[PDB]
Symmetry: C3
Subunit: 103 residues, 3 copies
Amino acid sequence: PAFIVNTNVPRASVPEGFLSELTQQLAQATGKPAQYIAVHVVPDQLMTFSGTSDPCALCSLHSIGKIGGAQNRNYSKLLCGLLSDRLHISPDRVYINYYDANA
Amino acid sequence: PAFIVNTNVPRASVPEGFLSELTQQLAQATGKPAQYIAVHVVPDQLMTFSGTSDPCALCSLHSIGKIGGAQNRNYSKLLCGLLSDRLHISPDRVYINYYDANA
Amino acid sequence: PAFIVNTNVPRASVPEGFLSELTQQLAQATGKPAQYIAVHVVPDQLMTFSGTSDPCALCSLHSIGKIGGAQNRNYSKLLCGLLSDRLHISPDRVYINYYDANA
């Protein structure tokens, strides 16, 4: 699958090893080997979310299958927590859309 | 909903207050409170449109519902006009795709 | 149609004339006049692909029709080869998704 993150936090607030960590995390969460994963992080964006430009993140995960409700819940929790902790965004400001990359 | 704008106009040609204005506009147009809106503007892009790299904009609006034909018309008019006026792009060079964010 | 390319190769590794070339290529491949084509190239991205941050490219082609299997094959070959040659990415590191822009 492919995980895209669009964020208004500065490029310098992104830790060394963040793309590697996130990559390993998705590999754990999805049960897919790192070989089937792509991560794309885009910092320094001009964005408003729920009315303000406080730190936020619009993300999307694209898979070649339909994710189930339990997976959605488990992915969002894991992914929002990772993003809020490492990039310091309030959990309620990280939004994730799931797309059936082949549907 | 979420409105994404990809444009080749420079970051400095984007006015102070543009994200706030656009945000308020979408809130008016859609009847949704600013709380349910996200705007993402990406300037300085390398893009050609109808063959040239004259100023242009590729945008997409993502909603959790199907937009009707009258809404599409009303959204495009309002949104293209706002973008052409504030960012100085010819109206025929602003393209908007509508996605049913949950379909 | 619209062809989007997200790549981790530097902006300076992108040749003068690349957007014009790619544009003409899509016009040839699809049988559509340059007027119906848009190209968007985004370099300098933070991305991992199959586990590493070696040069790669995540792309998507959006059309107002369903592409057939022969077209997919023909588009991928042409497009991956163009991208690998001009931007120096290993062919197995260029991924292209096809979307029915109006479906």
